[PDB]
Amino acid sequence: DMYIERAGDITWEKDAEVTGNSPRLDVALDESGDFSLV
């Protein structure tokens, strides 16, 4: 039995930690909702 609990407001935070790269990838999406690399 699953339940939900509030974790916060949805807001943009000024000066949040900035990380991650921006990869451009060729992908395929199957009928089961799984993404894969082409």
Partner 1 sequence: TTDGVYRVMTRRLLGSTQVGVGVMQEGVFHTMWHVTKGAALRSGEGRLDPYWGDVKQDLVSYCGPWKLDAAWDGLSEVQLLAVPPGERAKNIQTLPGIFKTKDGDIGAVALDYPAGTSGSPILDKCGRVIGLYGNGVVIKNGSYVSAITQGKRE
Residues at the contact surface with partner 1, assessed by CB under 8 A: 1-13, 16-29, 31-33, 35-37
Long-range contacts of residues 10-13, Cβ cutoff 8 Å, at least 24 apart: none
Contact between residue 27 and residue 36 where contact means Cβ atoms under 8 Å apart: yes
Q: How far is the CB of 16 from partner 1 (least distance, A)?
A: 4
Q: How far is the CB of 31 from partner 1 (least distance, A)?
A: 6
Q: How far is the CB of 37 from partner 1 (least distance, A)?
A: 6
